[PDB]
Amino acid sequence: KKIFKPEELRQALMPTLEALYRQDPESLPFRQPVDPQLLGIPDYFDIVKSPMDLSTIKRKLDTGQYQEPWQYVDDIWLMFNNAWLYNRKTSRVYKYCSKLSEVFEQEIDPVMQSLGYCCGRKLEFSPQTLCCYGKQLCTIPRDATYYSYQNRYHFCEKCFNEIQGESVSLGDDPSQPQTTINKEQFSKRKNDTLDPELFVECTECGRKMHQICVLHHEIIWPAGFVCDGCLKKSARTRKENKFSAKRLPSTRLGTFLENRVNDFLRRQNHPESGEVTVRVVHASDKTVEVKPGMKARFVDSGEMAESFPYRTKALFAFEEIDGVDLCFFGMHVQEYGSDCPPPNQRRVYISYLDSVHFFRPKCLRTAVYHEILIGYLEYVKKLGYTTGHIWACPPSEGDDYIFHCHPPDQKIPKPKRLQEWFKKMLDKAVSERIVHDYKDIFKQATEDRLTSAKELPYFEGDFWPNVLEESIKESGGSGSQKLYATMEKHKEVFFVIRLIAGPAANSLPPIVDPDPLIPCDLMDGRDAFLTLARDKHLEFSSLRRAQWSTMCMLVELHTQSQD
Amino acid sequence: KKIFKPEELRQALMPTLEALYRQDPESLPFRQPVDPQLLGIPDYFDIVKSPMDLSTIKRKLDTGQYQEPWQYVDDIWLMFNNAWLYNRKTSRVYKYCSKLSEVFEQEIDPVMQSLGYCCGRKLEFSPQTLCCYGKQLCTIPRDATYYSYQNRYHFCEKCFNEIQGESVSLGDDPSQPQTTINKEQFSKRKNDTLDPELFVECTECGRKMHQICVLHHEIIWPAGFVCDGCLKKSARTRKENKFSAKRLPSTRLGTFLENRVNDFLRRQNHPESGEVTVRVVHASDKTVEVKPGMKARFVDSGEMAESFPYRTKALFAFEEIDGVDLCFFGMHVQEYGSDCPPPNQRRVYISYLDSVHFFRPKCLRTAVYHEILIGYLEYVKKLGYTTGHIWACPPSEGDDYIFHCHPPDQKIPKPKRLQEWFKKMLDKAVSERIVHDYKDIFKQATEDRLTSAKELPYFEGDFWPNVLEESIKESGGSGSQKLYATMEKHKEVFFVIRLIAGPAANSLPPIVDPDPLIPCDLMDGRDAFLTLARDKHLEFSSLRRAQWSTMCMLVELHTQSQD
Ligand SMILES: CC(=O)N[C@H](CCCCNC(=O)CSCCNC(=O)CCNC(=O)[C@H](O)C(C)(C)COP(=O)(O)OP(=O)(O)OC[C@H]1O[C@@H](n2cnc3c(N)ncnc32)[C@H](O)[C@@H]1OP(=O)(O)O)C(N)=O
Ligand SMILES: CC(=O)N[C@H](CCCCNC(=O)CSCCNC(=O)CCNC(=O)[C@H](O)C(C)(C)COP(=O)(O)OP(=O)(O)OC[C@H]1O[C@@H](n2cnc3c(N)ncnc32)[C@H](O)[C@@H]1OP(=O)(O)O)C(N)=O
Ligand SMILES: [Zn+2]
Ligand SMILES: [Zn+2]
Ligand SMILES: [Zn+2]
Ligand SMILES: [Zn+2]
Ligand SMILES: [Zn+2]
Ligand SMILES: [Zn+2]
Ligand SMILES: [Zn+2]
């Protein structure tokens, strides 16, 4: 019901238009309508379907042809966009248009906020990286050229010509079907699509606002979105967000971890700090099956179990930033209890761990990650797990372990840095008398005097079961030939962590998890959360997006159980 | 003297050569000598004046032709650049070489420190931009084509071709007459010159180690450089550096500022922190002379003083990092005491202010800057100065206020940030009862009810003297027509800080500096330090470089006073 008078707009908007005029000599190609004849370029109007310049925008602002502020922002970007679509990253017009937008990004935000809006940015989702289907490590970066069929199966232009002739094997994904598709049936594409961010309208104002900015979810507030401005003018606020990190069900594991982190934070008494919530959101019983090579060498002759049972758990840590939950750490673990046979007995394995670097304060981020991890080791140690195993291997270019689409400026560690990061955490744990000691897989195997692949712990998704299949094949049926060699080669990447050692490790009681099972398909393994994020445009790439993603993650965790 | 056994060099260096070999398929074009025939590229043996590859480097490392480890590092980088030059970054060959180099960067550093060297990086100083002579604001970027006479006068590609007639008038540079020079007598260069870092030999072991890495100065330790290892082999260490930041002569002002900062760090109790040393390294008395325009309008009239006397000071803050001094902040001020006629009477002005972002801990950096600023404003108040002035404006791209060549990842704030930065600093000083109030120049002029330009503080180098020249000139003789308008246009950038408000001004005691004069040509204004740095290749671009520059800066300060 809010009416905007054409003179209250120019009162607010014109300053930021003038600030674009005032840039000598950067605004020249924009000050008056582009005239293709007067610059000799007949291929202009055919490339720019609807053009814009500075005076056209000014005329509309002076006459009164802008109903609402976004129309003015939209034209301003239209003008920039045409200008980028013609010139290259190399010319002068481009450089100029960059400057104006750069200047405009600066002025528009306060002004738009003056008018009662969330911001003044034009916001879109940069094209995600896709999975090349040929190599299995192959990746498709933004702007690259790729081939799709039914928008499922995409191929990197290199991988695609590495195919035999014109017939492509495809859809080997679920079950038996080997549907064979011809090359002619594919779409040649550029991974360059830009989806805009969505707006939500205020049911009292009428103002378009960025969904992600105002954090409005249809499930949490089904009455409809009411902007802060309107809420303040009636001395009221939003309903409580019942779907919070804090209100996720508690478990002993979570309570233990968060107490540790929070106690740690208190002793620091650092001023930017806020309390950390830790929640276990998945817990289920699984079995890993020994693969066919190792099964035929060791299982069929009864030297090794055909499978090992383990519990898998997914846990996340959250912090309140600007009065809103943000998810900053995640981890999936595998726990092989006392009922599991050798050699996996009483071992825990960290499948995957991951983070988004928005924890406040930056100063204590690493230390908190170390605290959560050391705390996990301390928990399972008390219950009776004797040993922990960690495969320290950073994700490859544009892969994400748990959180879809990280911030562009959250550097990923190289192997050395990651290995030293783990050595630091474990050294801490060694000095608190929690971890007894640790060694790389090779020094450990020597220590334990092992002589056969069958003595190596065998975890779901780990590196060793795969290399053992190759070992047995390549060596003609042996299970020891290149074992110590392979262990040397990769040694500094494979941490083996002794929580309980010596004679003490032999006369221990049964391991009992006081926590109950927690079914939750969304976090059974890591692929579902990644898919959910890919599917719903969730990103962890900026604080505001991480906040919204977190908000959605929670709504999913809460509405999955209740039915 | 340490000749290396050829065996020492194989069992240390091969792991890094094998690491490059291990890269399938990224080392394929580098495995064999480039036989231009087999490929289909004729011009190889003319552009690459010497080819290099992994087979040849393997040959030498096995036959012991490598005398010292740096030859191996050169050949590795010989090979990389050869391939990096012949292709552009578009191709496949170039990308491959880039992965290779990153692998080598990751492998070589531990290996070289095992061989007793500082590091294994190949280091050079990237060219700095140069002043174009034509526009007098024109600039020559790295890699841009340009023209030069002697090594003094340079011209951008376009500027040079935009002087018609084929003769150039160089010699605006001195106050000596205007010579003229042919166009044939200029050199066509490219700005692609890279200077290697210098090495220093150890007088015992004989290894080349990077000067900047081991911080050896001919003047500090004139009995030759001895490496860290050789000192550790003799149960002895380097003679105490007598040219420290700490041993710079103290001042009552210096001591006041550092006592504030260090009390501040003690109260914070943050476990990363080092002590801060503030020293004033320049104090000279000067006078700013009213420029021609205003001189004619107001001075000859008898309405305002022809020139104002001020004291100028330069003060730097240092921190101990890895046991070495690092200069991290710098400020020049202009102090207009009680002997100074209006309107400048009892006003301080911050000429310039700069920083290098390596202060530990990061999370206290901004606070410490503020404590220094709030400390200065508190010191001048207690001395009897009523009013401080700050021209909040960040440096242009590629420009440096005080420290030459900043780190590439030290973001420079945009105006709205820098403005908010001074507000946070001031609000704290108002919280602390030190600053009474502060306002923008336009609101302050309105309160003081000013009516004429003769009433505005006239500071050396500040924005207003220049703009007042232009205003009188364009208005045809008027002293104050655009005045309030001009002040309004830039209000947000000119801070007016009131230290003593109201009645006090009428009869405060005279202002006396308890500190003596510190003559120091190097720190008289900002140009001499920038110039020294540009001349001696001093940079503040990394921790190691910034440390070396601090060492030289400190040597230069210590050896002007003494003869
Ligand atoms: C099947 C198969 O084949 N392969 C595999 C099998 C998978 C095995 C799974 N194994 C595991 O899951 C256990 S190890 C994996 C670790 N997880 C990740 O790495 C995910 C992404 N990384 C992160 O979330 C964080 O980086 C984290 C590792 C949590 C630590 O963050 P941090 O903040 O405590 O330290 P920092 O990151 O070094 O940064 C701390 C400082 O170092 C800086 N820094 C970091 N990296 C770099 C760099 N590369 N260059 C320069 N600086 C750099 C960073 O900027 C920063 O500065 P500051 O704090 O001053 O701002 C598969 N399934 O795909
Ligand atoms: C003649 C004429 O026409 N014109 C002029 C006339 C001269 C007038 C002279 N006036 C003055 O001397 C007074 S104005 C002060 C200007 N001095 C400088 O600007 C030197 C370069 N800048 C700095 O040394 C520092 O930035 C400093 C100003 C000390 C503040 O450092 P900081 O660290 O406390 O705050 P932060 O930098 O904002 O950073 C604080 C956070 O904000 C971040 N940040 C900073 N800038 C940006 C940015 N642009 N974009 C995004 N993020 C950004 C930064 O990375 C960071 O994150 P974190 O702490 O999590 O890492 C002439 N003569 O040429
Ligand atoms: Zn918004
Ligand atoms: Zn491909
Ligand atoms: Zn509203
Ligand atoms: Zn801190
Ligand atoms: Zn070095
Ligand atoms: Zn030029
Ligand atoms: Zn030596």
From Swiss-Prot, chains A, B:
Q: Which residues form the Bromo domain?
A: 4-111
Q: Give the free-text PTM comment from the record.
A: Acetylated on Lys at up to 17 positions by intermolecular autocatalysis.
Residues reported in the UniProt entry to bind acetyl-CoA: L353, D354, S355, R365, T366, I412, R417, W421
N6-acetyllysine modification sites are K135, K291, K428, K454, K482
Task: Quote the annotated effect of T312L.
Answer: 40% decrease in activity
Residue ranges for the region (Interaction with histone) are 352-354
Superkingdom assignment: Eukaryota
Q: Where in the cell is it found?
A: Cytoplasm; Nucleus; Chromosome
- Start and end residues of each CBP/p300-type HAT domain: 242-562
Q: Linked disorder?
A: Defects in EP300 may play a role in epithelial cancer. Chromosomal aberrations involving EP300 may be a cause of acute myeloid leukemias. Translocation t(8;22)(p11;q13) with KAT6A.
Q: What is known of its domains?
A: The CRD1 domain (cell cycle regulatory domain 1) mediates transcriptional repression of a subset of p300 responsive genes; it can be de-repressed by CDKN1A/p21WAF1 at least at some promoters. It contains sumoylation and acetylation sites and the same lysine residues may be targeted for the respective modifications. It is proposed that deacetylation by SIRT1 allows sumoylation leading to suppressed activity.
Task: Quote the subunit structure annotation.
Answer: Interacts with HIF1A; the interaction is stimulated in response to hypoxia and inhibited by CITED2. Probably part of a complex with HIF1A and CREBBP. Interacts (via N-terminus) with TFAP2A (via N-terminus); the interaction requires CITED2. Interacts (via CH1 domain) with CITED2 (via C-terminus). Interacts with CITED1 (unphosphorylated form preferentially and via C-terminus). Interacts with ESR1; the interaction is estrogen-dependent and enhanced by CITED1. Interacts with HIPK2.
Role this protein plays: Functions as a histone acetyltransferase and regulates transcription via chromatin remodeling. Acetylates all four core histones in nucleosomes. Histone acetylation gives an epigenetic tag for transcriptional activation. Mediates acetylation of histone H3 at 'Lys-122' (H3K122ac), a modification that localizes at the surface of the histone octamer and stimulates transcription, possibly by promoting nucleosome instability. Mediates acetylation of histone H3 at 'Lys-18' and 'Lys-27' (H3K18ac and H3K27ac, respectively).
Identify this protein by name. Histone acetyltransferase p300
**Which organism does this record belong to?**
Homo sapiens (Human)
Q: Which gene encodes it?
A: EP300
